[PDB]
C-alpha cells in the first residue's frame, strides 16, 4: 500500500521541477513591506503573473509524457489550466507560515490591492479552504500537475491520452493522502474537491484584471494570450 519505486520516482521528479518555483518569501515580504497603490499592485500582479506562466510552461513540458501529446492539446491544456495554477500557487503562498499578525496583514493588503469587491470574498474563501487542508509541498506539486493534466477540459481532442498521464499522479496523490494522513481518510477526496472549486475562477478571470481599480490596464503579450485580455 506504500509508494512503489516508480511512485517515489514520479514524486521526486515532480517535486524538483515544482521547486524551480519563485521563492514565496520574495512575494510576501514585498506585500507586507509597505502598502502600495492599486496601480503599483496591478503592475506587481502583471509581472508576477507573466513570470508564473513562464515557470508553468517549464514545469508542464517536464510532466511525464506531456511532450508526447498532440501539439494543439498541449496548448489547450496549458491555456485551460494557467489561471487555476496561478490561483493554486497564490493559495499555497497565502497559507505559508508567517509571524503573528503577518497573515492577517498580507490578507488586508491583498484585500486593498485594487481587485474589485465582487472577486474578494470567493478568492479568500478558496485560500482559507486550501489552508483548512494543511496541504504539504508534495500535495501542491501533484495537485498542480493534476490541474494541468485535466482531460475534462474544453477543446481537448484526445482526452484518453491526457487521462493516461493524469492517472499515475492521481494514484501517487491518493497513496500520499493514505500513508501521510491516516487520521483523515477523506483527505484525497477533499483535495479533488478544491480542484472543482478552482475552476470557478475561470468564469470571470479577464474581468478580475479588467475591473482592477486603475485607470489603464496594460498587459504583457504573454499575459494577453493566457488571460483573455486586450
Amino acid at each position: 500500500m506504500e509508494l512503489t519505486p516508480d511512485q517515489q520516482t514520479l514524486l521526486h521528479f515532480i517535486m524538483d521541477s515544482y521547486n524551480k518555483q519563485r521563492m514565496p518569501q520574495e512575494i510576501t515580504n514585498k506585500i507586507l513591506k509597505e502598502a502600495f497603490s492599486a496601480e503599483e499592485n496591478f503592475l506587481i500582479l502583471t509581472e508576477m503573473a507573466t513570470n508564473h506562466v513562464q515557470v508553468l510552461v517549464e514545469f508542464t513540458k517536464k510532466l511525464p509524457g506531456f511532450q508526447t501529446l498532440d501539439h494543439e492539446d498541449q496548448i489547450a491544456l496549458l491555456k485551460g489550466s494557467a489561471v487555476e495554477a496561478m490561483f493554486l500557487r497564490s493559495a499555497e503562498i497565502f497559507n505559508k507560515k508567517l509571524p503573528s499578525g503577518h497573515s492577517d496583514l498580507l490578507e488586508a493588503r491583498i484585500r486593498n490591492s485594487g481587485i474589485s469587491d465582487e472577486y474578494i470574498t470567493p478568492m479568500f474563501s478558496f485560500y482559507k479552504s486550501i489552508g483548512e487542508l494543511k496541504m504539504t509541498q508534495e500535495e501542491y506539486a501533484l495537485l498542480t500537475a493534476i490541474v494541468i493534466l485535466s482531460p475534462d477540459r474544453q477543446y481537448i481532442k484526445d482526452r484518453e491520452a491526457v487521462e493516461k498521464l493524469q492517472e499515475p499522479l492521481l494514484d501517487v496523490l491518493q497513496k500520499l493522502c493514505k500513508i501521510h494522513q491516516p487520521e483523515n481518510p477523506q483527505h484525497f477526496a477533499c483535495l479533488l474537491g478544491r480542484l472543482t472549486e478552482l475552476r470557478t475562477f475561470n468564469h470571470h478571470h479577464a474581468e478580475m484584471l479588467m475591473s482592477w481599480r486603475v485607470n489603464d490596464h496594460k498587459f504583457t503579450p504573454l499575459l494577453c494570450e493566457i488571460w483573455d485580455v486586450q
Binding site: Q54, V57, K61, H71, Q74, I75, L78, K79, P221, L222, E225, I226
Partner: peptide
C-alpha cells in the same frame, strides 16, 4: 493563435 505559448512549448 497562441503564438507565444506555442513558441515556449516548441523551443529547446
Amino acid at each position: 493563435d497562441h503564438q507565444l505559448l506555442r513558441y515556449l512549448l516548441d523551443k529547446d
